[PDB]
Amino acid sequence: MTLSILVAHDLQRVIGFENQLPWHLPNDLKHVKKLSTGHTLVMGRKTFESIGKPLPNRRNVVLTSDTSFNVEGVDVIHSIEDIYQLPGHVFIFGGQTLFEEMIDKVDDMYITVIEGKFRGDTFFPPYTFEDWEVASSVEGKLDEKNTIPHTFLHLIRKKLVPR
Numbered sequence: 001m002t003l004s005i006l007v008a009h010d011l012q013r014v015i016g017f018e019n020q021l022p023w024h025l026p027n028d029l030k031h032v033k034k035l036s037t038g039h040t041l042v043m044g045r046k047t048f049e050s051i052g053k054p055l056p057n058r059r060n061v062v063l064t065s066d067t068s069f070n071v072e073g074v075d076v077i078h079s080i081e082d083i084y085q086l087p088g089h090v091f092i093f094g095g096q097t098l099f100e101e102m103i104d105k106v107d108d109m110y111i112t113v114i115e116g117k118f119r120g121d122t123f124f125p126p127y128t129f130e131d132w133e134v135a136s137s138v139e140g141k142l143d144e145k146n147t148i149p150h151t152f153l154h155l156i157r158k159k160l161v162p163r
């Protein structure tokens, strides 16, 4: 009933490499935990295999065509259309295929911009700020543990109006 994208992508829109995050960034995991806590994560089968187990304290939903898929702690779905039946705040969690499928459908997007260029093999779909309003933009703090500049965006889809 309220559907969002949750993603971290670098300056070229890279989001993954060899089924892993290209970068080590603890604050963004804290970001993800705070945002989706008590809510619903919807993700594809490869993304789930990457994480390797349900995230606690929230509903984990996996989309796959495998009818044998039945993990403990994970609710499974078999079509995009199934996502609209999930109640509450749903976060499209990844990966590339689900982002491509969902980017025109979601209300808003919570994007962590990783301010670097990483080698990648999976990408977030292109988008333009002409379409998306910057609800907030906040620089992450850097320290010994979080050494890559990053920016937390909250983007809301702009309404189409006659001008």
Ligand SMILES: NC(=O)c1ccc[n+]([C@@H]2O[C@H](COP(=O)([O-])OP(=O)(O)OC[C@H]3O[C@@H](n4cnc5c(N)ncnc54)[C@H](OP(=O)(O)O)[C@@H]3O)[C@@H](O)[C@H]2O)c1
Pocket: 006, 007, 008, 009, 014, 015, 016, 017, 018, 019, 020, 021, 043, 044, 045, 046, 047, 048, 050, 063, 064, 065, 066, 077, 078, 079, 080, 093, 094, 095, 096, 097, 098, 099, 101, 122
């Ligand atoms: N930086 C970030 O914020 C971010 C977010 C999450 C993931 N990642 C990353 O994204 C990468 C992988 O992305 P990916 O696109 O290759 O895989 P993926 O999107 O995570 O999911 C792959 C799978 O989901 C399925 N699926 C997708 N649409 C479906 C539909 N309409 N009906 C039924 N099943 C459907 C299939 O499962 P089956 O083949 O089992 O049928 C499919 O092959 C990783 O390398 C990873 O680290 C990073």
Ligand SMILES: CCc1nc(N)nc(N)c1Cc1cc(/C=C/C(=O)N2N=Cc3ccccc3[C@@H]2C=C(C)C)c(OC)c(OC)c1
Pocket: 006, 007, 008, 016, 019, 020, 021, 028, 029, 030, 031, 032, 033, 047, 050, 051, 055, 056, 057, 092, 093, 094, 111, 112
């Ligand atoms: C972080 C990757 C990513 N980033 C963004 N912005 N959007 C996103 N949609 C994601 C998606 C994402 C995620 C993760 C990691 C999730 C995770 O490990 N947590 N998040 C929820 C959670 C809930 C309860 C307890 C612990 C956690 C834990 C956070 C810690 C404090 C350790 C991940 O594995 C490393 C991954 O690999 C492909 C992808």
